[PDB]
Design a binder for this molecule. Sequence first.
Ligand SMILES: NC(=O)c1ccc[n+]([C@@H]2O[C@H](COP(=O)([O-])OP(=O)(O)OC[C@H]3O[C@@H](n4cnc5c(N)ncnc54)[C@H](O)[C@@H]3O)[C@@H](O)[C@H]2O)c1
Ligand SMILES: NC(=O)c1ccc[n+]([C@@H]2O[C@H](COP(=O)([O-])OP(=O)(O)OC[C@H]3O[C@@H](n4cnc5c(N)ncnc54)[C@H](O)[C@@H]3O)[C@@H](O)[C@H]2O)c1
Ligand SMILES: *[C@@H](O)/C=C/C=C(\O)C(=O)O
Ligand SMILES: *[C@@H](O)/C=C/C=C(\O)C(=O)O
Ligand code: NA
Ligand code: NA
Ligand code: NA
Ligand code: NA
Lengths: 483, 483, 483, 483
Amino acid sequence: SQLLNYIDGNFVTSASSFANINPVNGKLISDVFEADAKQVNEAVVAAQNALKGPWGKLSVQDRAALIHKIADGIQARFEEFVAAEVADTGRPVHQARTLDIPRAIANFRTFADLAKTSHTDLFEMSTSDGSGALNYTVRKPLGVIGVISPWNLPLLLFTWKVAPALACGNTVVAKPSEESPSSATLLAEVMHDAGVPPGVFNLIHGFGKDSAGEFLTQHPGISALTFTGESKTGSTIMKAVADGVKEVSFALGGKNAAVVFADADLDAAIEGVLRSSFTNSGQVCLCSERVYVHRSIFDEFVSGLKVEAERLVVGYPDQDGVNMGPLISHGHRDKVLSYYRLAVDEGATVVTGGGVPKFNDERDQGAYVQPTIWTGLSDKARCVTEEIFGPVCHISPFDDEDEVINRVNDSNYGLACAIWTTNLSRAHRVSRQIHVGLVWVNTWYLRDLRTPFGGVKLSGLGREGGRFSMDFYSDIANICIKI
Amino acid sequence: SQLLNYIDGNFVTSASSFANINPVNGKLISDVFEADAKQVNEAVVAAQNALKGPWGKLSVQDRAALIHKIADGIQARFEEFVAAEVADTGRPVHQARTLDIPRAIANFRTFADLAKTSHTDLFEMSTSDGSGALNYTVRKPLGVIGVISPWNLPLLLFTWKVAPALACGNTVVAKPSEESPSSATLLAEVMHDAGVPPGVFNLIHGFGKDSAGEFLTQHPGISALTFTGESKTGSTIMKAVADGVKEVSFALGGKNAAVVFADADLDAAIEGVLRSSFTNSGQVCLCSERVYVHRSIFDEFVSGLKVEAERLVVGYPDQDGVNMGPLISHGHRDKVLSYYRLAVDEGATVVTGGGVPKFNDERDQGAYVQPTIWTGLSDKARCVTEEIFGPVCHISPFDDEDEVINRVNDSNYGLACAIWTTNLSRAHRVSRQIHVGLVWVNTWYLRDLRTPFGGVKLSGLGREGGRFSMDFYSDIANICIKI
Amino acid sequence: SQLLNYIDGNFVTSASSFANINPVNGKLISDVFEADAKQVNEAVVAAQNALKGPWGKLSVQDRAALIHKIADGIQARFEEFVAAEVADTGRPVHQARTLDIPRAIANFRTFADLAKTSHTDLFEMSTSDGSGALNYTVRKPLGVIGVISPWNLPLLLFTWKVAPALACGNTVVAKPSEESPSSATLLAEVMHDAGVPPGVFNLIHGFGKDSAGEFLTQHPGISALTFTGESKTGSTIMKAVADGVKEVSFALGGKNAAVVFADADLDAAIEGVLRSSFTNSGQVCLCSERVYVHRSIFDEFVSGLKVEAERLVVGYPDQDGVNMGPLISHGHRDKVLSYYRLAVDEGATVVTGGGVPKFNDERDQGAYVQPTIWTGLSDKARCVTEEIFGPVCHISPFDDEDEVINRVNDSNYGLACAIWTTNLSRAHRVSRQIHVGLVWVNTWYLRDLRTPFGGVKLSGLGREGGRFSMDFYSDIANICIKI
Amino acid sequence: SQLLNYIDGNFVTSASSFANINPVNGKLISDVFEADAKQVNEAVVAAQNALKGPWGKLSVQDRAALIHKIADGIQARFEEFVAAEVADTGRPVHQARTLDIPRAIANFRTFADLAKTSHTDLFEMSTSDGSGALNYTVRKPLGVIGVISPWNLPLLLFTWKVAPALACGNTVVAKPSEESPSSATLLAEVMHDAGVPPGVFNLIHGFGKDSAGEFLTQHPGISALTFTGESKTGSTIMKAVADGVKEVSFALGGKNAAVVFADADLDAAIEGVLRSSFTNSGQVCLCSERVYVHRSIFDEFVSGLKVEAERLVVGYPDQDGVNMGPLISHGHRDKVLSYYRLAVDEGATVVTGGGVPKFNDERDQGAYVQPTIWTGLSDKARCVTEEIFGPVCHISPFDDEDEVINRVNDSNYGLACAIWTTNLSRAHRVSRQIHVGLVWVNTWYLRDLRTPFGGVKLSGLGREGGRFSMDFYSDIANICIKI
Ligand SMILES: NC(=O)c1ccc[n+]([C@@H]2O[C@H](COP(=O)([O-])OP(=O)(O)OC[C@H]3O[C@@H](n4cnc5c(N)ncnc54)[C@H](O)[C@@H]3O)[C@@H](O)[C@H]2O)c1
Ligand SMILES: NC(=O)c1ccc[n+]([C@@H]2O[C@H](COP(=O)([O-])OP(=O)(O)OC[C@H]3O[C@@H](n4cnc5c(N)ncnc54)[C@H](O)[C@@H]3O)[C@@H](O)[C@H]2O)c1
Ligand SMILES: *[C@@H](O)/C=C/C=C(\O)C(=O)O
Ligand SMILES: *[C@@H](O)/C=C/C=C(\O)C(=O)O
Ligand code: NA
Ligand code: NA
Ligand code: NA
Ligand code: NA
């Protein structure tokens, strides 16, 4: 398998390629051509030009219909997309079929639809000569949108950014994670076979620092950079676009909490926290790495969760009943294992997991870890405050509502929080006090694509979703007519 | 006159003071205590703590009423505010009476009202279990807003930021320009007398680099930095807050064009470009420093505008018939004159002005320049491309509508544009193709405070005004209830 | 006390007058001049001409200022409006001071503010020739608004309609209930003193059929009729305006249910039903005259409610601890007691009340009844299905959630419902299935003036409140510009 | 046996049938089964029950997808719908192919998409106890929507009502005009084949008074009546639903003006008024039957219009170059001719037309009239004030802007107006002064489905389109949660 860049409607190679590795078994899936600076520049110049081409003559209806045809194109090759994402990431085949690929199709459909329904504002005003004036606003393409996406939900997160960008009439230069370039390379083919005009969508492969990522980010021809990934990388990008005062949208790290109150459905909460901690092998920005449980139910909670955690089938993506795949890479497994060790040193009681499973097959050449649960760390322990991004959670008891609110908020992160309670007052009283972008009550990672999505503090900047995307990916222009 | 900081409800001095100079005659107005890094810290910490005090517990409608009292308090001392603004900056008294102070009062009233009327969103969704879920959004105080403002329209721009910050329930640490500290200090007196809780509004005086401005900007306790000023300054601030991923809102430099089509009402356009070029002595980010006029009317437009510019009265703030005051400072005048000779060096014809008026009285120790019109520079000339921020405009002919659109857009700035034409289609056709945040047709600087205001490219990022402000100065939070 | 009409900036009498009677003691309070058909004509014509005068030239901001001036005027005569409302209706002074008069003031201010903040819409479209077109909407005054209000909440409901009418720039001909004429007449005094131009606000007194009310609805010069009152009267007015196709907005009767689930806070629910059945002596359209309580707590609820209802103080408006004044009039009391008898005929257990209290003072000549609770009627009983509009509820057990939802919805009315439950899911699940315009959970008649307000089925048509009032009281006009 | 009713999922006949006549030649096209009171009852009960079936359980996304399938179903049978529409109406085949059928399809698609994008509101408030409350709104199906549609744009208008009715989750009982029942009959087959559940969409045929229309209108089981047609019929319908207080939405007659100012593009304006007077043979509610032209261009305008009008090809729907078909029926033709005669009695000059063309073939048996232009009537002539609904316009000169605005607004109708001018100020200054729901500038009948559509005065009640339809076809419910 080989992965090429897609630039101005042509698939091209580079002066250097790098390896894409199947994390299940450590085998090489493909060679990926790393776009160099010159190739990045040629991508940005083509996107700039495509704005003055036929793409720019498209009506909002026709533009939307072509976008639906992109979505149709994915559905047409659906099983191939499942396969690509699995290969790259080792995610359960089932998860890719029901979450990753359908969501990516919905991303285009939703923004196409929004592109047709969205309108702007009329403001009337009086003037000293008694004739008055009109102010109306319009949404225009921002211009060239730089897209840099991570490896955890590769197609889902890539299209979450590309779909609104294109729905708003922009052109795109997009750099998917080095770890998961396949689904995106397939998307490039779909764009091509859909008739998407050359230069409208450009795919560049490579890494971050000193590679395609950084180059995109320093290129003066882009109008915006929308980014999803590590919080320190966001800060880096922010400095990098700062001289050109580019528009920026960041969705970054979390150290998310789940809170289980004494009046929760205990069974539901054990299940809910199971999913929030070990979905995608804990490799979601939204996962609950910290969990607080009311003292009256703490032991029974931990017991129930240890049990459910131990039932999880960690194995082949297509293995019957498989709940967990491996981590994305060996690099990332090193990091996580380091935290596993650090938790021990920090005084943690390992309730379950804490190492790597043994398969006695090619999987031992992969990057699996076990779902871990910890107990017994203080609120200041590095393991409770820093993002690990593995299938792991620490559980602590609490006694008071105000106490636990304060403990959830005592963080430099503020992405999401899940709350469990059956009490109507509590649910609304507590939810509005959590200093994050996203609260779920009695569920987790339930997504309505119209809602504003984003974090506070280190967890991000800006919001995406619904009109928040329609606004971010557009110039808002105000036009004032004296009458 | 002594100008103290206002921190945690107390007026305080500092170890170091600096001079506030009247640009009309170079006289010392006041001494201003420069807040040090320790005092900046006190203000932020106080602002943080105010959030958990009585301020935090006010209903939206009680907050709004208090903000109307701030407005009332300014009205009550209207002429003192007029005097302070005039003293600092040399602006004609009439301008201070009609634009400057009324707008600061209106800023507070407009946003107090929006605080009461604004609401958020409800999203219903289906779930696999058929029970559905509810997503609702809420606006909360973002936290501590750092405000840093420029000297050209001091109280107007200061309150443009402080009013929505307070209306959204934030607490504020605000640093007005070192050239224009007086109206902000009077505002702190109004806040005090109005009973605004201590720590809610904090005034820190000083400079930018290695001073109060930079310290505010580096403090980890702020939640956002909103800034109006030079574009390179914006970049610096953006770099400075990057490690903290602070929300940012910037309104930056411009090199705005006016365009006069052959079907313009010629006299209205002459008068209009007069205003857009020389209002506030050209020290408005909105001012037209480039002007394009159709060939068939170029000569007559130029001659008309010359006569009108030479009729402008340049003088004392309360002189009879005065149109223009000085520039803000000797420092700024040096920069402006430097461009004036650059224009000669680049080959411009000086239609008028191009120097300093001679008064033969105390005003000669002030910072006056002449209103200045150039002709004959190419589009690449630095004087046509770089923001001067003085009372100057270069005028150039054009023949074709597309050509002029391209000439207007061929800029690293994109703040505003003014267009003159009596043609219905033209006004809408052309306006939408100008790459700026703000277009005016047959007028200029006519403001409805509900409109989004801001720039593209180097002229800013984000928008303010109406709901754009209400969204920027608020945490937007999505709460999702599984049913 | 003399109550005159106010037509075209003047107070005028009429050829016929009728008695305003204090329901506390049956005493004469005022003579009220009944406008005849000629006078209603005079009012409408003056209102038509007012739209062409100075009122029509006001900016939105100026119009809003003046309406705030109306609200200042009522505040400055606060206690006079209290006394006027109390004399007409017998309502407790505290209720007048806390709900009635303050809401009338807040109605004016809320819509004044909405007049300032409200804006309209901009829709861009493609055209076959490629040049495109734009559609913008504006709100204009509808024209002359005919207002007809009831006696149960005289000034609150009168101003609920008059405030948005005026705020949207219309002119008004308004006819308060013949039973409660006084506060509306003081309002005409405030309008006059505040310098509202003549013809903008016209007050006409009288009855329905063959009097001022009917003449209003029949007049071709009005543009809309907004009405609050009995459902059958809504129907008559709908027929009356049909030939003119006048805009209509109706808030009508109800037979509202309250539902107490097993998981309810029982003491709170008992207090809340006490309030929802007997506030204003049950003479609120939102009152709960049907109550359903889970069988498991039915006996305990009914006992608790009996105790609380029997502690209600029935007496003078300023009597210490007073909970209930009299009914509006002897005629209304006749209706209510005839229902008290009917309930017994239909087989009800009279839990408490069911007659008139004996005072041994002037109150015996008034129109008092006792607060009254019934048990043991079928869902088909007339007393359980017909609106009584007095201080009464019937309580009935239920077993199942779907059952009680069907029972509540089983009605020709659908104004409001109140639900008691501490369970998060139940609150949202059940609320969305009640076929009414207004649900409260764990409270009753809590009003945010921005929300849509109205009923379904016989309880109304249209909604008012927030932008719904702003839309109803305005012509919405679409203007399409081919570019 | 040709055109059957469609009730609870079955095509059924009726006791009595009536003739459908082709207006090209007076021949029988089909027999139509007239639904009786019993069958109208069955349809309404079945629609009531369908709300409780699976249609009731569809998610908003599935409901939308299903509506897109109805649309696909029409597209699949495109030319069959074209032929049915042409057969009933005589409309040119090109008009059917480009306007009628595509618009019908776009109706279903636009509202399906709005169903998925539309959201509601969240309002936060403070309370006495310091805990606060939430108010949130939801859109629910109104219930059974009764649709009564006219014959002039049969499928377009029928689906303009049925699409948002179905998109908001309602069920429908719809009665197309006796004159044009074929396309609606095919639509029922498309619903059937798409698997729309039984009772969700019901088609009943017949007349107004004493037939299916009147019966639908009086049935206690509908929740709303949306109607398009003559004003007097709107009035009758308004009275009929009055006892039930059913929600109503009316788009009624007009007597629309076009205004041509001296600075218009004269050739565009002639073309423009030629389209607005004579499209669909003047059988559009939006047609200009009154035309006002500035005296300086009056004779030239009239001369130009005459030439263009006499170039119109009046004939067969498939006739090479055809512009206009017949009127809908003999009875309508008699009406129009009656006006043609009345116009002469009122002293008009017949610039062109005024009678029936002599074809010397089977068209002479159809219902054709000539396109007609009058001059010389007074503003009070019946022919200038009463809607004729034929291919005719009267043209009158004017001198002053305020004069022509008054004469335009001097009407009991107020549906639409067209203005021709190239002047920027005039366009916006004049458009806002015309008392109609819809204004076009330099065009006519250009429709964006998002925009509010409706009239003032006799021309209608309420607005449809965009969110206006989503609100009318829904219950709006406010739910308030005490916290
Ligand atoms: N876009 C707008 O709406 C708008 C409005 C007014 C002025 N401006 C721009 O402002 C400029 C002229 O005004 P100016 O001289 O006051 O701008 P400026 O950049 O010189 O300074 C503005 C403010 O920033 C502070 N500051 C300077 N350096 C700083 C630093 N390193 N860190 C933190 N704070 C710092 C200053 O003390 C001052 O308060 C022009 O470019 C003009 O277009 C823009
Ligand atoms: N405002 C708009 O959007 C619009 C659009 C198209 C046409 N129209 C109007 O349609 C009119 C032409 O309508 P028409 O000639 O179809 O006659 P019509 O308006 O009387 O009939 C229209 C529909 O109403 C039904 N109907 C008639 N009388 C009824 C009754 N008493 N009860 C219940 N239903 C009844 C008919 O059977 C038919 O289906 C013109 O006034 C024209 O302006 C308005
Ligand atoms: C973080 O890893 C999760 C992000 C999810 C979204 O961006 C999404 O569901 O759209
Ligand atoms: C009147 O004949 C025309 C009505 C048109 C519409 O209602 C529409 O285009 O939606
Ligand atoms: Na990998
Ligand atoms: Na100074
Ligand atoms: Na009375
Ligand atoms: Na026919």
